[PDB]
Assembly symmetry: D2
Homo-oligomer: 115 residues x 4
Amino acid sequence: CPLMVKVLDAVRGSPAINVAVHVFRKAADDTWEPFASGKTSESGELHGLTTEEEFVEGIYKVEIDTKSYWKALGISPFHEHAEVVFTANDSGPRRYTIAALLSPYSYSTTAVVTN
Amino acid sequence: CPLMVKVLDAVRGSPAINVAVHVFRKAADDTWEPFASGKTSESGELHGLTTEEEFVEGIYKVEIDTKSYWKALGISPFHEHAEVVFTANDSGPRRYTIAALLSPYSYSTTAVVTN
Amino acid sequence: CPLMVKVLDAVRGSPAINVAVHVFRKAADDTWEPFASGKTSESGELHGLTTEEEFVEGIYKVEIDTKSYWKALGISPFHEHAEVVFTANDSGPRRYTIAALLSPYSYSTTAVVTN
Amino acid sequence: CPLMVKVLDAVRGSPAINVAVHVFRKAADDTWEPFASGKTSESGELHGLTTEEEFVEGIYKVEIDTKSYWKALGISPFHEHAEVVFTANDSGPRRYTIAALLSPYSYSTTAVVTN
Ligand SMILES: Oc1cc(CCl)ccc1Oc1ccc(Cl)cc1Cl
Ligand SMILES: Oc1cc(CCl)ccc1Oc1ccc(Cl)cc1Cl
């Protein structure tokens, strides 16, 4: 994976399972074009979003659908979603892990970027 | 003051000063329209974004211009900005504080909803 | 006020009220001795722990009694408490704010050192 | 591993490599007895601390030596260390991952607990 997403649940201390994730890439015109999407597994991880061929230089937005996740568990959370926006591969190809830690009124996000 | 933004710098252990903040309201066509903006003060806070009269129920996006903040300090950041998207409702009686804690490759955001 | 503690609840999106806080100073035999204590107020803050005169250079431990906080809300927490250990120095001119954001299986703490 | 520690660096967006970790277990008398120790690998992970036989019910403290980590990188951080204190295996045996995200004036810690 050049691009992986990992989500944890801070209330239960567990992976956040079945969290929808949509990724977009800023187009020529300056619009958010759909790029890839998927759902976290039982480990809270989403693999297979893209390949190193597809995953060119650009500005990407990883939208993590936190509100849906919390609602389905009986919690009415503050945020609509967690959005993570970043320039990727601008110094050549790299592997990105976008991690998110979710609470109903709070989240954190960290990127681990390696060669 | 129904809406307030407060940003901290986790690398220096200080308020994040002079950070640009842009707020958008979701329009009926699904577009984000400018709503309010400013720069955090010396205390890292941004007051007077809006009034009770103009802060109606709706979906808002608060964008914190983290990349510019880090670049002015000579530090290479990961994110384009941090975005906080939420629905404001029951109008009341409710003050919203969006807090953000910034690192170069990581941020958290929390909502403190009081009164 | 050279030392202040502020705690937020990430599950409710609110100040964490009535949280017990115990502070210890490291004694020359390597033991922690009681230094100051109190409970956070309605704003989630705890002021008047100490004075400039009694807050000398030294190693301090601030223990936030998170487990009791969660149990009074009917929620099963992971940690016994959150501990924040640091050296206070250059005496000045320096106000220390220890901030903490609490979830049942997770917390962050940040130091805001001003003046 | 019934007990694993994983540490990331929020400034560089990378695993925090070679971070010393010491674990203690509260004894009968009420003292912190040394239990296990080790250093994070290139992945930021510390495996092999203990076995399911050794890792009995008890109150454990995982001390993550953050100050040493930051100093060796030319940063003078706020905290002496990150301490994570919790009751383990009190409802039977479980697998614990203690994760930490480090910034010079800030850290978070999350526990992922599975069967
Ligand atoms: O983001 C925060 C994270 C922590 C845990 Cl490190 C503590 C405080 C924070 O920021 C705040 C934001 C708003 C208000 Cl009213 C109070 C606070 Cl303390
Ligand atoms: O970012 C994180 C920070 C902490 C400390 Cl509170 C705990 C979990 C995190 O999420 C990850 C971070 C890095 C990697 Cl490789 C995987 C994951 Cl699930």
